Swiss-Prot record, chains A, B, C, D, E, F:
Pfam families: IGPD. It comes from the Bacteria. GO terms for biological process: L-histidine biosynthetic process. Keywords: Amino-acid biosynthesis, Cytoplasm, Histidine biosynthesis, Lyase. Its main location: cytoplasm. It catalyses: D-erythro-1-(imidazol-4-yl)glycerol 3-phosphate = 3-(imidazol-4-yl)-2-oxopropyl phosphate + H2O. This is Imidazoleglycerol-phosphate dehydratase. SUPFAM superfamilies: Ribosomal protein S5 domain 2-like. It is found in: Cytoplasm. InterPro entries: IGPD_sf, ImidazoleglycerolP_deHydtase, ImidazoleglycerP_deHydtase_CS, Ribosomal_Su5_D2-typ_SF.
């Protein structure tokens, strides 16, 4: 059994994560940041995890703290659920084409904690994805991946090969991480 | 069962496509353009499709119309044979080394219809592959991929990482698409 | 005793500042601009001040006037609480690493009123930090530091050595100013 | 059964290779060049081969001859163990993240003998990895891959996408080749 | 009491670390890599730690694994000895002039795990410091700092402002980290 | 007791220095070069030294010889007063903001004799600070610092980060050296 429940309570936020690595994409994410919900829902589903995320934070300031605390907690949940990491595929990668965008992620689940994030166009450093609720600043993409990798204690390399639309660029990256994780997480019948 | 028979009759050409996604590489291609036959035969075989292509067109003008009409028909056949696309791997990619050439393709079979074609050296914009029959102008490579993606309604990203020989560059690309499709087409035991 | 209460009432805003230089980080900031609240709370806490800030302004226009009026009032409070500035360390500086960001501030509390703000990446000239309330335009960072220095009548040099995330860049700067002030404010046992 | 025993005796060196393609990572490598031992041990293990390498050569001159003769012999063993190459996956690739380094390899086991090695930073042309024994000059990395590909008669493309540490860069490449081989070597249930 | 004993046993190495944050510079380091011993001895002494390091590793390959495993273990010891980190100075920085070299380090002991290493001249990417024993490749400097920061879970920013001699550049950096840690580790009489 | 009296009599000048490291800023400087007097008075006061400087030299030629002989003598006095340098902070640095100018100095009192002087704008190579008496050529700034460091036998790194006014640039540097010395000179309760 590869499950983890993480409860993270800070001054900024209140997080509950329930994670099953061997799931069927049963995902419910509620952080108060709907685009982030969309991204983590995509992450959970495409990784074929079962994932519940319940988060309430200081979104009056902005999404940052909640986003970061959630990523930390999710990272911790991933590492805990992984356990000894014996007999797994360990390495995984995936390409995600999304209209004009092509993104890629590669992981080593038993490698030293590390994150390299490259290729993301410069305008995503100051782009806001905004709806009727709390907005999402795409500059946080790197932060999410770094927080995930550091707390799951994995090597995570995320690349944007090319792209234009910030929604496409961001979603393709989350999905790339997701499917890279899904491959690496699988039992390896020869290891 | 994931089969399709497409009959496409235009002023320019006459096309019959029989496609089985779950084949064993039983391929017979006859378009009147032998290098194109070679490319679609490679595509069918490396995708592990069963594929019959019968095409007669206005090759007195040049191969373009026949090539395009065939790609459209084949795309339509791929989309039809795919059906609802439920329970499939959906995403697929493949690297094809061919001597000095390295090509890559990535697909999303349930993504919006889109094609990105990059990295092909500039001389392929005006290169002709010529034998004893109707020649093949490599500038058409992009056209084929665009027609396939638009009519199969899939996201197809084809890259040449590097290469020199136009035959190698072209064949590696068709083979990359082929094996990307083969991976994406597979039943996914977790979806 | 090094305390000051400043009441500043303009057409744009209504400000009350209570400041104790020799505090324990007892801080409550409410300006109607939650990210600014976060920044001044960080400033008060890391400076080891006791600080209460109550501000209501024309946030329907934007945060600018409130932010500026608050910084002016806080500057005035700092200068008043400083008094004759006898027997204090006078000079102070601090480095603040915050993930990828490194910020620095240096102060001369008995120097001529002056502010130099350098190194902040160009995208912060047009970046918005936005939550569920009144947003914060990072272009105002310099304005805050200039208003503080001019009204406290101190020399304040704020540098960003490098950074990417606008939240990190901004917070590291406020914290750098805070800890620079804390050092400079201390009694000097040899002066 | 896909096994090979190669004995290679030249003026420069004395090599014994025992290879099983369908192994469990039972690896013992002893060439007199300990970093090279480390690399071939990583290669054997990550390829899921069973591999024994016993080599004694003119390491008083330097590691080159031994390294090259070993790579030639290992290549020959790989080609011999492959046999007719019927019913195998044929193509294989793998990404290896190693801290700051990302490496990639792609193979065609039934392609013409060819090696392309790109992306390795310029300082590896003159870098030495040195311990208490015979050192390893990283300039030899390309030589190893070229010798392997030429003697196994396979198409091998090795890329460094980025990296800094010569140990990371080198090991990630050997591991990339290893896992590319492992994928390509697998029986293909549809071919 | 702020002490930690860490025993780390991997396939590559065997490490014992005894650390006292509140020491008097009683330091004994023995890793089999004498320049590394010199660096960690400088680190322990200038941080005013009491530190014993006993390490035996695969130095026949090179110093890398031993160096890295030691840095990981030392990082873990630092984090464990830090405990809840309550009432400490938290932030610390130091400049180290060493002949022509000026180095700097800044830390946040309660910040998120992060390392930024900048300014080191390009020739240190391929420089070897060699004596009568196992040599030290200066490219590993960054690796050490990254491993320390990641495992101590601290924010560590190391800069070389300028320098020429690789021994000076390296030692000044270790000493900068040391004295930055010493400052940050101190009890803060106001926190 | 950390005091020194140096009498230096050359053909060019006649110098008497009385120095107390553990002073209260009781400073009297008279060299016949009033801006230099101002600089050494700032140096003595901000270092919290007790310092008397009496110098008469060949100011008819220019200030150079007197300035240099004074710096040599003062350096010698600093080194002599330092003694064995046991139990002192050893390292010290300070930032000095002065209107538009930011200067910095870092010292190692037990390091090898060395001086690095950087960042001073090019116009100070030929700037004269002139009053009603003997003028001061700012090109001499570097000379002063080099003479101080060489004769005190200390490592002294002086940087101008930025600035415009030659008076500000010069004074900020002397003050930076002063406060760097003051920090480094202090007893270290842990060494
Ligand atoms: Mn953050
Ligand atoms: Mn970047
Ligand atoms: Mn690629
Ligand atoms: Mn979407
Ligand atoms: Mn057309
Ligand atoms: Mn183009
Ligand atoms: Mn061909
Ligand atoms: Mn204004
Ligand atoms: Mn500017
Ligand atoms: Mn914050
Ligand atoms: Mn050779
Ligand atoms: Mn080359
Ligand atoms: Mn290794
Ligand atoms: Mn390493
Ligand atoms: Mn760099
Ligand atoms: Mn040394
Ligand atoms: Mn001179
Ligand atoms: Mn110069
Ligand atoms: Mn600086
Ligand atoms: Mn003055």
């Amino acid at each position: 059994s590869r499950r983890a429940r993480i409860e993270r309570r800070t001054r900024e936020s209140d997080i509950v994560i329930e994670l099953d690595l061997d799931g069927t994409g049963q995902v419910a994410v509620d952080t108060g940041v709907p685009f982030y919900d969309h991204m983590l829902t995509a992450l959970g589903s495409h990784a074929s995890f079962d994932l519940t995320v319940r988060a309430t934070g200081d979104v009056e300031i902005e999404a940052h703290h909640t986003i970061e605390d959630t990523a930390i907690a999710l990272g911790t949940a991933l590492g805990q659920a992984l356990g000894d990491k014996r007999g797994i595929r360990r390495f995984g990668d995936a390409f995600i084409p999304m209209d004009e965008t092509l993104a890629h992620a590669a992981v080593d689940l038993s490698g030293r904690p590390y994150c390299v994030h490259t290729g993301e166009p410069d305008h995503l450093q100051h782009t806001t994805i905004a709806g009727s609720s709390v907005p999402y600043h795409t500059v946080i993409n790197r932060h999410v991946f770094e927080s995930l990798a550091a707390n799951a204690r994995i090597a995570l390399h995320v690349r944007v090969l090319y792209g234009r639309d910030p929604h496409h660029i961001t979603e393709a990256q989350y999905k790339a991480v997701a499917r890279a994780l899904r491959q690496a997480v699988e039992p390896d019948p020869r290891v």
